[PDB]
Amino acid sequence: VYAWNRKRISNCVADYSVLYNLAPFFTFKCYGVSPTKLNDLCFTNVYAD
Amino acid sequence: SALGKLQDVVNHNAQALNTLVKQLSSKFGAISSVLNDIFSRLDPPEAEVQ
Protein backbone atom coordinates (compact mmCIF):
# COMPACT_ATOMS: atom_id res chain seq x y z
CA VAL A 1 0.00 0.00 0.00
CA TYR A 2 2.85 2.41 0.75
CA ALA A 3 4.56 1.81 -2.62
CA TRP A 4 1.38 1.62 -4.68
CA ASN A 5 1.68 1.17 -8.43
CA ARG A 6 0.53 3.78 -10.95
CA LYS A 7 -0.64 2.78 -14.43
CA ARG A 8 -1.66 4.92 -17.41
CA ILE A 9 -4.69 3.92 -19.49
CA SER A 10 -5.03 5.52 -22.92
CA ASN A 11 -5.88 4.79 -26.56
CA CYS A 12 -8.10 1.84 -25.72
CA VAL A 13 -11.74 0.91 -25.15
CA ALA A 14 -12.60 0.17 -21.52
CA ASP A 15 -15.25 -2.46 -20.79
CA TYR A 16 -16.74 -2.85 -17.33
CA SER A 17 -18.87 -5.97 -17.87
CA VAL A 18 -15.62 -7.95 -17.85
CA LEU A 19 -14.89 -6.81 -14.28
CA TYR A 20 -17.07 -9.53 -12.75
CA ASN A 21 -15.19 -12.81 -13.18
CA LEU A 22 -11.78 -11.18 -12.65
CA ALA A 23 -12.84 -9.54 -9.36
CA PRO A 24 -15.51 -11.56 -7.54
CA PHE A 25 -17.17 -9.95 -4.52
CA PHE A 26 -16.20 -6.48 -5.76
CA THR A 27 -17.58 -3.17 -4.48
CA PHE A 28 -17.63 -0.28 -6.96
CA LYS A 29 -18.85 2.34 -4.48
CA CYS A 30 -17.42 5.49 -5.98
CA TYR A 31 -17.60 9.21 -6.58
CA GLY A 32 -17.93 11.85 -9.26
CA VAL A 33 -20.07 9.93 -11.76
CA SER A 34 -23.11 7.68 -11.73
CA PRO A 35 -21.83 4.11 -12.27
CA THR A 36 -25.03 3.12 -14.07
CA LYS A 37 -24.04 4.94 -17.28
CA LEU A 38 -20.27 4.43 -17.41
CA ASN A 39 -20.89 2.49 -20.64
CA ASP A 40 -21.79 5.52 -22.79
CA LEU A 41 -19.05 7.94 -21.76
CA CYS A 42 -15.54 8.96 -22.79
CA PHE A 43 -12.57 9.57 -20.49
CA THR A 44 -9.54 11.62 -21.51
CA ASN A 45 -7.02 10.29 -18.98
CA VAL A 46 -7.38 7.22 -16.77
CA TYR A 47 -5.00 6.35 -13.93
CA ALA A 48 -5.13 2.98 -12.18
CA ASP A 49 -3.59 2.57 -8.72
CA SER B 1 -37.67 58.48 -36.27
CA ALA B 2 -41.22 59.23 -37.46
CA LEU B 3 -42.32 55.61 -36.93
CA GLY B 4 -40.75 55.32 -33.49
CA LYS B 5 -43.73 53.83 -31.67
CA LEU B 6 -44.25 50.74 -33.84
CA GLN B 7 -40.52 50.03 -33.93
CA ASP B 8 -40.51 50.43 -30.15
CA VAL B 9 -43.25 47.80 -29.88
CA VAL B 10 -41.25 45.40 -32.06
CA ASN B 11 -38.02 46.09 -30.16
CA HIS B 12 -39.69 45.63 -26.77
CA ASN B 13 -41.11 42.24 -27.70
CA ALA B 14 -37.91 41.05 -29.38
CA GLN B 15 -35.65 42.08 -26.50
CA ALA B 16 -37.96 40.58 -23.86
CA LEU B 17 -38.06 37.28 -25.74
CA ASN B 18 -34.28 37.33 -26.21
CA THR B 19 -33.79 37.99 -22.50
CA LEU B 20 -35.99 34.98 -21.80
CA VAL B 21 -33.95 32.75 -24.09
CA LYS B 22 -30.59 33.98 -22.76
CA GLN B 23 -31.65 33.46 -19.14
CA LEU B 24 -32.04 29.75 -19.94
CA SER B 25 -28.24 29.36 -19.88
CA SER B 26 -27.97 30.63 -16.29
CA LYS B 27 -26.44 28.46 -13.58
CA PHE B 28 -28.81 29.40 -10.72
CA GLY B 29 -26.09 28.25 -8.33
CA ALA B 30 -25.73 24.82 -9.94
CA ILE B 31 -22.54 22.91 -10.54
CA SER B 32 -23.53 22.88 -14.23
CA SER B 33 -26.30 24.50 -16.25
CA VAL B 34 -26.96 21.48 -18.51
CA LEU B 35 -29.44 19.06 -16.96
CA ASN B 36 -27.84 16.19 -18.88
CA ASP B 37 -24.44 16.81 -17.27
CA ILE B 38 -26.19 17.00 -13.90
CA PHE B 39 -27.80 13.66 -14.75
CA SER B 40 -24.49 11.99 -15.67
CA ARG B 41 -22.56 13.37 -12.68
CA LEU B 42 -24.45 12.93 -9.41
CA ASP B 43 -26.60 10.46 -7.51
CA PRO B 44 -30.38 10.96 -7.89
CA PRO B 45 -30.55 11.92 -4.18
CA GLU B 46 -28.63 15.15 -4.91
CA ALA B 47 -29.51 15.41 -8.59
CA GLU B 48 -33.04 15.85 -7.24
CA VAL B 49 -32.26 19.03 -5.30
CA GLN B 50 -30.02 20.26 -8.12
Side-chain angles (χ1 to χ4, degrees), chain B residues 9-48:
Chain B
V9 161
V10 172
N11 287 358
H12 276 310
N13 196 359
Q15 75 90 29
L17 196 66
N18 187 251
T19 289
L20 202 61
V21 71
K22 290 194 290 185
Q23 192 161 30
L24 194 64
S25 69
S26 176
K27 196 65 53 63
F28 291 81
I31 46 170
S32 184
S33 176
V34 179
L35 74 164
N36 199 356
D37 298 358
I38 306 300
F39 268 25
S40 86
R41 198 78 63 66
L42 294 174
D43 211 15
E46 53 266 28
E48 189 274 332

Side-chain angles (χ1 to χ4, degrees), chain A residues 27-45:
Chain A
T27 298
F28 63 92
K29 180 263 293 179
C30 70
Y31 294 99
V33 64
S34 82
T36 181
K37 51 193 290 202
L38 285 174
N39 282 351
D40 48 299
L41 282 173
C42 283
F43 316 126
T44 67
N45 191 5

